[PDB]
Amino acid sequence: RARTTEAKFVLFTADKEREKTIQQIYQYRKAHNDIAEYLKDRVLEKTEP
Amino acid sequence: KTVGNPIGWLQEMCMQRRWPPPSYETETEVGLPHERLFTIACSILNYREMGKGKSKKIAKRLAAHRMWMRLQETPIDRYEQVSKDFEFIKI
Amino acid sequence: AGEQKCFDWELMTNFRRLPQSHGSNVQQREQQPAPRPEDFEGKIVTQWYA
């Protein structure tokens, strides 16, 4: 949604949940990276199920 | 301070000393389905201790830990303000 | 010199940008130089705590 140039994305979390939300965000980033690399490396001639 | 498996230690003490194995009873289940509280009892000989928790597992573990300590012992009107020095920490 | 006026070079060579208002904790305030009145006379200040 924050699609403008130099946009700011702000997260509000409490102190006790900082570690868990940081781990959650890293998990989301890892999922995004895995999606990207799976879409990149995979090659198929049939290209249809 | 409940670092470990206190129920395992409790049953270890029970069966090592040939004391009766730890009996466990569930008396009450109170609260709304998304905030139910569970109450688990533990009874060995004449000692009976209570453990409460959001889950039956947690309440059972707390009761076991409590009586494990027991058997070793006996052989504002205001919201707090926040500082303005908060910064934006990159993630 | 005299009634003639000239450009105020020092202020602009100092105030390229307005310094940002930052608070000071007791630890770093302890060894800071003691405030002296003539540095606070006829100047601009702001409350960083409020």
Q: What is the DSSP code string of C12-29?
A: HHH-SSPPP-----HHHH
Cβ–Cβ < 8 Å for A9, A2: yes
Q: What is the DSSP code string of C34-47?
A: PP-HHHHTT-----
Angle subtended at Cα B85 by Cα B82 and Cα B91, rounded to the nearest 5 degrees: 100
Contact assignment for C49 to B85 by CB distance below 8 Å: no
Experimentally determined by: cryo-EM
Cβ–Cβ < 8 Å for B44, B23: yes
Can you tell me the distance from the alpha carbon of B87 to that of C48, in angstroms, rounded to the nearest whole number? 14
3-state secondary structure of B52: strand
- Beta-sheet strand order (sheet of B23-30): B23-30, B37-44, B47-53
Neighbouring chains of C at 3+ CB pairs under 8 Å are B
Cβ–Cβ < 8 Å for B79, B60: no
| Å between B35 CA and nearest CA of chain C | 40
Which B residues in the span 30-89 are in contact with A, Cβ-Cβ below 8 Å? Answer: 88
Question: Which residues from chain B sit within 8 angstroms of residue C23, using beta carbons?
Answer: 84-85
| Nearest Cα to Cα of residue C18 among C38, C44, C49 | C44
* Residues in chain B preceding a C-to-N separation beyond 2.5 angstroms (breaks): 75
Tally of CA atoms within 13 A in the half-sphere of A12 that contains its CB: 0
Can you tell me the distance from the alpha carbon of B86 to that of B31, in angstroms, rounded to the nearest whole number? 38
Contact assignment for B91 to A10 by CB distance below 8 Å: no
